[PDB]
Amino acid sequence: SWRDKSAKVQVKESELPSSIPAQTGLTFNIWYNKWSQGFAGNTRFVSPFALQPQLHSGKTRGDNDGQLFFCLFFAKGMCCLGPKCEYLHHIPDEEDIGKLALRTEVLDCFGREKFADYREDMGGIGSFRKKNKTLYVGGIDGALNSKHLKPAQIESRIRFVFSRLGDIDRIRYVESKNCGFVKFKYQANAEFAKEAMSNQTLLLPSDKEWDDRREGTGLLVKWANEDPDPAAQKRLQEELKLESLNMMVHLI
């Protein structure tokens, strides 16, 4: 278990990467940390690190404290503070979700405030106005360096990746749209994965494009608008009703 052992360091701050990405332009902008005098070509790239959770997850300063938030850099798999980190280092569970359930309405499991609206992409941390648990998973074409895999193969690999990080409500790959819709058990979990597999690789050691994983462009894990499909809409409605019955009985 995670609770059996202390959390290992993801990567030592020597191994950590600098804040000077890619020279996308002609000159560096000090107050922005971005580049400038040229926006030729796309910015995004593939994460060097990944949350290998059983090899990494463990105790922290936080697990002593009762810090209610998980380490963004743990999710990214690059936390340079291992056991000395205040933010936690393990997969969110019912106990921890339950623990922070008050605050998590307003903000993420990464302890950062949600907003009125989704960022037009549905790309950034979720809005407070929706309690979404469903991540859109674009850029699979890019995430596998143009590997002509089977849809079954794709969906299975996706399953392997996101099931590892959180309890699944459902997943469904769409051949016609080349993307995923990865509904989660909890919003905290959803948040965690959404960072934990942002800019990651779907590739594996068994695959031949393993050393070219860095060179492509990573998974585009964003948030999902609810489907137009009335097949699931009805289900959603039913769920809402059920939940409402719970709370309403709880009021008295």
């Binding site: 404290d65 810090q67 209610l68 938030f69 205040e86 008050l102 605050r103 309405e105 307003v106 302890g111 405030e113 949600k114 907003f115 009125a116 609206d117 407070f128 106005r129 929706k130 309690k131 299975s156 399953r159 309890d167 699944i168 409500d169 459902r170 469904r172 769409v174 051949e175 016609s176 509904k183 058990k185 097949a231 289900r235 039913e238 769920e239 809402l240 939940e243 409402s244 019955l245 709370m247 309403m248 009985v249 009021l251 008295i252």
Partner: protein
């Protein structure tokens, strides 16, 4: 302007201490709703609690929604605003929404208006709240060691977490597609599979009016495959 309105923070949120010491930065942030300066209040719930609680939204916004300024929940019932609006829509009415305008200028404008939104009109006056509650209440009343199964007859609404937890109770991996319902369950060992089977909407073969069920499965499966 003058600090005329007081902050609108709820109890649960704020924590069970007789006296906390919070700080107020006036004109201290744009809110999370209406992009508009307001007096940001914040406090650690306990002295040694690491998480500060800062007042996300502005007081006008809070009043408007009739909510907490830190929780974003109704100050009465401590529940999500959308959810409470749904509840209100359900009892006594058919339609009660609280539409926030997603355009940066208009949101400000809306915030400025001293007018309660749909659900807020109910929950403000406690009498009406009580009435709503009572109305709601009224409304209420053979083991070959395969380690790998293929489960069928899966209710469309059921989630994988429910399944796996059920299995655990009766005790790993799992694959489900709600289109096909070809629940490609796989156990971490064959001995575990044996244990499970020996321990036994649970239609369960061990591949590696049931007829009509098979047909329904069939067509659905086919459709899934075409997708």
């Amino acid at each position: 302007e003058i600090n005329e309105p007081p902050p609108n923070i709820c109890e649960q949120c704020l924590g069970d201490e007789a006296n906390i010491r919070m700080t107020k930065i006036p004109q201290g942030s744009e809110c999370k709703i209406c992009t508009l300066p307001f007096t940001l209040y914040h406090f650690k719930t306990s002295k040694r609690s690491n998480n500060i609680i800062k007042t996300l939204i502005c007081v006008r916004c809070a009043t408007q929604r009739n909510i907490c300024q830190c929780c974003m929940l109704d100050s009465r019932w401590h529940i999500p605003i959308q959810l409470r609006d749904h509840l209100i829509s359900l009892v006594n009415e058919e339609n009660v929404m609280t539409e926030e305008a997603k355009n940066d200028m208009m949101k400000r404008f809306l915030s400025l208006k001293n007018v309660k939104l749909g659900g807020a009109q109910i929950t403000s006056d406690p009498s009406e709240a009580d009435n709503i509650v009572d109305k709601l209440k009224n409304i209420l009343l053979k083991n070959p060691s395969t380690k790998s199964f293929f489960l069928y007859n899966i209710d469309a609404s059921i989630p994988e977490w429910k399944i796996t937890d059920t299995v655990s109770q009766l005790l790993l991996s799992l694959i489900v597609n709600h289109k096909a319902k070809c629940g490609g369950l796989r156990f971490q060992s064959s001995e575990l599979g044996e244990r499970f089977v020996s321990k036994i909407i649970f239609i369960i073969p061990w591949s590696s009016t049931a007829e009509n069920i098979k047909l329904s499965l069939s067509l659905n499966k086919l459709i899934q495959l075409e997708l």
